Structure 1
Amino acid sequence: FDDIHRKRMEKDLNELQALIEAHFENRKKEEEELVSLKDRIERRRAERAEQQRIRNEREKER
């Protein structure tokens, strides 16, 4: 019986460390990859938006 309790602590603490790591790392990987990716998407969209604004001004003159 008390071995059940020990097994529970063994899995919970192995899980705790796996989880402190997975909780943090899954977010740091997904989250930093996401902002890095979307920081670039945001910049590329802003660049394209500026280019289209310029393109629209050029057509207006045409």
Structure 2
Amino acid sequence: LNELQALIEAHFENRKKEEEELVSLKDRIERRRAERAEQQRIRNEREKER
């Protein structure tokens, strides 16, 4: 059953690599969007200060 071996590894290797990468890639996108939220907070504070 070469297929069980192909599947046992394909399931794990293709997914752990692609999936964990999406977790951290998006974590950075999300952190940047969170920075945008901070920058909007900053923008709101600056408009009020002016």
TM-score normalised by structure 1 residue count: 0.70
Q: Could you give the per-residue CA deviations for residues 5-41 of structure 1, whole angstroms, max 9, x where no partner exists?
A: xxxxxxxx21111111110112111211110101111
Q: Sequence identity of aligned pairs in percent?
A: 100
Query: For the residues of structure 2 that align with 1:60 and 1:26, how far apart are their CA atoms?
Result: 51
* Unaligned runs of at least 5 residues, structure 2: none
Query: For the residues of structure 1 that align with 2:14 and 2:28, how far apart are their CA atoms?
Result: 21
Of residues 26, 30, 34, the one that matches 1:42 is: 30
Larger radius of gyration: 1
TM-score normalised by structure 2 residue count: 0.83
CA RMSD of superposed structures (Å): 1.1
